[PDB]
Amino acid sequence: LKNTNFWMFGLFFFFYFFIMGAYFPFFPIWLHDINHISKSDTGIIFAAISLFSLLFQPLFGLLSDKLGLRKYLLWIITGMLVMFAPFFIFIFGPLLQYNILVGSIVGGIYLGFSFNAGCPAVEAFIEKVSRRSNFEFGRARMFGAVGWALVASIVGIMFTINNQFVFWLGSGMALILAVLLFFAKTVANAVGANHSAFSLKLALELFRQPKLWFLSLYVIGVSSTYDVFDQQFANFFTSFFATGEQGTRVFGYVTTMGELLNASIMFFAPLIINRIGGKNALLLAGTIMSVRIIGSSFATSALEVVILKTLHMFEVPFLLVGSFKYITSQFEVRFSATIYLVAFAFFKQLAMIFMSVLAGNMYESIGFQGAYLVLGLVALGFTLISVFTLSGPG
Amino acid sequence: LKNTNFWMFGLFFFFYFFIMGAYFPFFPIWLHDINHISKSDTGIIFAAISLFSLLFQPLFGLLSDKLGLRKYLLWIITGMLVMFAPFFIFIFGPLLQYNILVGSIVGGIYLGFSFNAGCPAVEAFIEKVSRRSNFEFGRARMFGAVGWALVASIVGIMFTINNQFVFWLGSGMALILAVLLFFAKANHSAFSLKLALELFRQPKLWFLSLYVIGVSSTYDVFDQQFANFFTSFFATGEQGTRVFGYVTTMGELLNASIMFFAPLIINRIGGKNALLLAGTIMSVRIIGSSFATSALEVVILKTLHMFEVPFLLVGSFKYITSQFEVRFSATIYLVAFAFFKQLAMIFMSVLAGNMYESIGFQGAYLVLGLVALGFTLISVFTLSGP
Ligand SMILES: *SCCO[C@@H]1O[C@H](CO)[C@H](O)[C@H](O)[C@H]1O
Ligand SMILES: *SCCO[C@@H]1O[C@H](CO)[C@H](O)[C@H](O)[C@H]1O
Ligand SMILES: [Ba+2]
Ligand SMILES: [Ba+2]
């Protein structure tokens, strides 16, 4: 309402999703369209993205939650963010062009994990400040969602003109804006509080129950398959458009409009989830997941691929809250700590290391639409197996 | 549009007016409110400010224009700017508190002239880069005006909390930002003694000089310590700087908006009338400040400074352009606008500073408001006709 720390972190949510909004959606276009990198090479890039995510994400889930609460980690993340443009334009870009991809990927994910493994730890850090004060994390998260939307259109429109200055703008937002939010720093009943910790015996007891294994199979079979599908979908999407400018213009307009569609539906989504149930609503996401990949295998027009892109926005709430309420309804509260780590974060990244290579090589071999039928078949395949992930009903 | 040197120098306009926006408007408040310096002492500080300006400004007008074009001078200015905070917090601040003002003023203006005499030379150096390329100086100067406005509100709001870190921010802005702009690296006039001697032969200069000394210097001195007088009308110490921060920021947006449409007015009214209009609004503010009673009344007096500026910037330009030979313009700016104004401001700052200690702010404001309006009435007859 008037909380001084609220604006400190509300703008921090906005100015981080500014740099997040610049990098992530326009990352594959910057590799193929701009850096002229092949489909197999991009497959190697995204495999290394998932590898550093598998290493750094569990390290931050133990740090930020326990010792990291003293703002030390958040400064390190900002230290990398300050040198956003003098990395892509000066270090990252030429290392890829050097034709040695193996040498290049290592140095590439060192600044890459600040968004992949970095963001959940930053979102967990602002989750703690919101619980300490009056302001709610839900309204604080929405402050940043507009920053993701504002950039997506601005980068999409200004890309073909000069992508170099949009990168040169993001680094500045981490420099002139992020530091200002850092110098001005820091009996209670919480509405939602997750003060959890994990151990080897907690994980060993989690391995005793088959519930985890059937859940893991959905995370690997369906989710990882779909997550890999989106890694290089942008290049396939842009191809359907009249010009090179027409591709990025519409792709910029879609992620911006899609975010407003996502937040609007994610709002009314818990009402639906509670009536459908955790298992059934999770499978609702799996159908709208696989229908997009399998629909992409027969894609013919530009307005047809626009309709396919929006499906991703109908999918997200039924999997964000869908995964939450499943663990909440089918697992002990104490186990939730290992669950996110073991399945949601470890098994998903391990599957995404190999799946990204195989699909990346499939675009080089059988093409986009060719690979989409293979991945669309397996995602729908595991979705049909997920109907009987507990016991055979009657 | 896409000029690589435009962004390298447009941001240079922004990040300099960042440090300019920190120092200049909040300089008197840092002396009286913070350093606890008297009105007579501040009068001595501003006299030394005008003395180093009278010495360094003519030296840079000959350097940057001729030899200085090889970026050597711009590097020296940045060398002082890097040590902005380790000067005010470490050297300048204690020297004043060492209750020896004479010893302190000398060392104070060595970094002080980097903004007073420094800025016109920086604005002239960048005027040359704009002339060399596609991008225009008019749009490049505006790039920096937002930097002056962004800081003014940020310093005004954060001052009472910790003024030490805002100073610690400006020095870094010259360090991490200005150096990066250095790795990535028409008025062609000259002046002489005979040009200046031919200038003294014509009475036009003397009548113009009298307006620059009588009216302008009087008004410029008035603003040197007005901020302290303004902050007094406000509910708290926080209320003074908050509104003073909001006013210079809003006033800049009001100034740029009106200076845009101003040349249209000037060309219809004439050069003399533009100066006569600027002088009336100048003296009315000073004389109005002598009877000031409320906080929203002083806010209205502060905005009048923003109504005045275009009628004197372009007002002075078109007068020389319309009543003097193009060759003479080089000396004109040095002789009256820069030398006579600073010489008058050396003594006027001492006398007015001593007047606040003697007859107070409002008291001094009637003496200065009477003379400024006095010279404005004589400028109706003295100044060269339209
Ligand atoms: S750490 C949160 C970032 O996740 C992304 O958030 C944006 C904008 O808020 C969109 O919701 C994307 O779908 C998420 O991947
Ligand atoms: S070299 C600049 C001196 O002029 C001042 O510039 C600031 C920043 O834009 C404002 O225009 C002030 O009104 C001027 O005094
Ligand atoms: Ba949570
Ligand atoms: Ba000029």
Q: Which residues of B143-168 are buried (b: 16+ CB within 10 A; e: fewer)?
A: bbbbbbbbbbbbbbebbeeebeebbb
Distance, in Å, from the CA atom of A165 to the CA atom of A159, rounded to the nearest integer, reads 9
Quote the tokens at residue B106. Answer: 């000398």
**């931050």: which residue's tokens?**
A60
B7 shares contact with chain A (CB less than 8 Å) = yes
CA distance A131 to chain B (A): 25
Can you give chain A as a three-state secondary structure string?
A: CCCHHHHHHHHHHHHHHHHHHHHCCCHHHHHHHHCCCCHHHHHHHHHHHHHHHHHHHHHHHHHHHHCHHHCHHHHHHHHHHHCCHHHHHHHHHHHHHCCCHHHHHHHHHCCCHHHHCHHHHHHHHHHHHHHHCCCCHHHHHHHHHHHHHHHHHHHHHHHHHHHHHHHHHHHHHHHHHHHHHHHCCCCCCCCCCCCCCCCHHHHHHHHHCHHHHHHHHHHHHHHHHHHHHHHCHHHHHHHCCCCHHHHHHHHHHHHHHHHHHHHHHHHHHHHHHHHHCHHHHHHHHHHHHHHHHHHHCCCCCHHHHHHHHHHHHHHCHHHHHHHHHHHHHHCCCCCHHHHHHHHHHHHHHHHHHHHHHHHHHHHHHCHHHHHHHHHHHHHHHHHHHHHHCCCCCC
Residue A297 in contact with residue A368, Cβ under 8 Å? no
CA of A59 to the centre of ligand 1 (A): 21
Q: Is there a contact between A162 and B2 if contact means CB atoms under 8 Å apart?
A: yes
A267 shares contact with chain B (CB less than 8 Å) = no
Report how far Cα B224 is from the mean position of its chain's Cα atoms.
10
Task: Pick left, alpha or beta for residue B320 (phi over 0 → left; psi -120 to 50 → alpha; otherwise beta).
Answer: alpha
A116 Cβ closer than 6 Å to some ligand 1 atom: no
CA distance B37 to chain A (A): 29
Distance, in Å, from the CA atom of A252 to the CA atom of A165, rounded to the nearest integer, reads 17
CATH number for the domain whose boundaries are A1-189: 1.20.1250.20
Instruction: For residue B135, give the nearest of B45, B7, B232 by alpha carbon.
Output: B7
Name B117's Cβ contacts closer than 8 Å, sequence gap at least 6.
Answer: B52, B53, B55, B56, B57, B59, B60
What resolution in angstrom units was achieved for this structure?
3.4
CA distance A173 to chain B (A): 13
Distance, in Å, from the CA atom of B51 to the CA atom of B45, rounded to the nearest integer, reads 10
**């193996």: which residue's tokens?**
A102
- The total of other beta-carbon atoms located within 10 Å of residue A112's CB is 24
Distance, in Å, from the CA atom of A35 to the CA atom of A181, rounded to the nearest integer, reads 34
Ligand nearest to the CA of A17: 1
- Relative to the CA of B123, which ligand 2 atom is closest? 1
Name B204's Cβ contacts closer than 8 Å, sequence gap at least 6.
Answer: B323, B324, B384
Residue B132 in contact with residue B76, Cβ under 8 Å? no
End-to-end CA distance of chain B: 40
Domain with CATH 1.20.1250.20 in chain A: 1-189, 190-394
Q: Residue B200 belongs to what H/E stretch?
A: helix B193-201
Distance, in Å, from the CA atom of A363 to the CA atom of A373, rounded to the nearest integer, reads 12
A123 Cβ closer than 6 Å to some ligand 1 atom: yes
CA of B309 to the centre of ligand 3 (A): 56
Quote the tokens at residue A146. Answer: 């507009």
Using a 6 Å CB cutoff, which residues line ligand 2? B 17, 119-120, 123, 145, 148, 252, 255, 309
Domain with CATH 1.20.1250.20 in chain B: 1-185, 186-386
What residues 151-170 of chain A have any CB closer than 8 A to a CB of chain B? 161-162, 165, 168
Of A161, A162, A183, the CB nearest to B165: A183
A185 shares contact with chain B (CB less than 8 Å) = no
Name B356's Cβ contacts closer than 8 Å, sequence gap at least 6.
Answer: B39, B40, B43, B225, B364
Q: Is there a contact between B2 and A183 if contact means CB atoms under 8 Å apart?
A: no
Instruction: For residue A306, give the nearest of A252, A265, A352 by alpha carbon.
Output: A252
Sort out which chain A residues have CB atoms less than 8 A from B178's CB and list them: none
**What are the distances in angstroms from CA B57 to CA B15, B51, B128, B250?**
22, 10, 18, 29
**What are the distances in angstroms from CA B322 to CA A262, B186, B331?**
64, 17, 16
Q: Which residues of B185-220 are buried (b: 16+ CB within 10 A; e: fewer)?
A: eeeeeebeeebbeebeeeebbeebbbbbbbbbbbbb
How many beta-carbon pairs below 8 A join chains A and B? 8
CATH number for the domain whose boundaries are B186-386: 1.20.1250.20
- The total of other beta-carbon atoms located within 10 Å of residue A207's CB is 11
Distance, in Å, from the CA atom of A352 to the CA atom of B293, rounded to the nearest integer, reads 72
A89 shares contact with chain B (CB less than 8 Å) = no
B1 shares contact with chain A (CB less than 8 Å) = no
Residue B221 in contact with residue B349, Cβ under 8 Å? yes
Q: Which amino acid is at B101?
A: L
Instruction: For residue B161, give the nearest of B241, B86, B216 by alpha carbon.
Output: B241
Quote the tokens at residue B230. Answer: 């303004």
- Relative to the CA of B122, which ligand 2 atom is closest? 1
- The total of other beta-carbon atoms located within 10 Å of residue A391's CB is 7
For A176, the closest chain B residue by CA position comes to: B173
Distance, in Å, from the CA atom of B109 to the CA atom of B115, rounded to the nearest integer, reads 10
DSSP for B346-363, written as a single string: HHHHHHHHHHHHHTHHHH
CATH number for the domain whose boundaries are B1-185: 1.20.1250.20
- Mutation pick from B169, B171, B180, B181 vs chain A, by most beta carbons of A within 10 Å, is B169
- Relative to the CA of B145, which ligand 2 atom is closest? 9
Q: Is there a contact between B2 and A175 if contact means CB atoms under 8 Å apart?
A: no
Q: Which amino acid is at B30?
A: W
CA angle B370, B374, B375 (to 5 degrees): 130
Instruction: For residue A106, give the nearest of A45, A194, A32, A167 by alpha carbon.
Output: A45
Distance, in Å, from the CA atom of A303 to the CA atom of A35, rounded to the nearest integer, reads 27
Residue A313 in contact with residue A264, Cβ under 8 Å? no
- For a mutational test of ligand 2's pocket, the pick from B13, B148, B309, i.e. the residue with the most ligand atoms closer than 8 A to its C-beta, is B148
- The total of other beta-carbon atoms located within 10 Å of residue B49's CB is 24
Distance, in Å, from the CA atom of B186 to the CA atom of B172, rounded to the nearest integer, reads 34
Instruction: Please tell me whether residue B133 adopts helix, strand or coil conformation.
Output: coil
Residue B357 in contact with residue B39, Cβ under 8 Å? yes
Report how far Cα B36 is from the mean position of its chain's Cα atoms.
24
Which superfamily, per CATH, for A190-394? MFS general substrate transporter like domains (1.20.1250.20)
Residue A145 in contact with residue A316, Cβ under 8 Å? no
Instruction: For residue B87, give the nearest of B64, B115, B63 by alpha carbon.
Output: B115
CA of A120 to the centre of ligand 3 (A): 9
- Residue nearest ligand 2's atom 13 by CA: B252
**What are the distances in angstroms from CA B70 to CA B59, B64, B185?**
16, 8, 11
For B11, the closest chain A residue by CA position comes to: A172
Name B133's Cβ contacts closer than 8 Å, sequence gap at least 6.
Answer: B3, B5, B6
Instruction: For residue A247, give the nearest of A235, A259, A232 by alpha carbon.
Output: A235
A79 shares contact with chain B (CB less than 8 Å) = no
Q: At what angle do helices A137-172 and A118-132 cross, to 10 degrees?
A: 130
Residue A342 in contact with residue A21, Cβ under 8 Å? no
By the 10 Å C-beta count (0-12 exposed, 13-18 middle, 19+ buried), A333 is classed as: exposed
- Mutation pick from A8, A173, A179, A183 vs chain B, by most beta carbons of B within 10 Å, is A183
Rounding to the nearest 10 degrees, give the CA dihedral for residues A66, A69, A72, A78: 110
B2 shares contact with chain A (CB less than 8 Å) = yes
Quote the tokens at residue A378. Answer: 């397996």
- Residue nearest ligand 2's atom 2 by CA: B119
- The total of other beta-carbon atoms located within 10 Å of residue A188's CB is 7
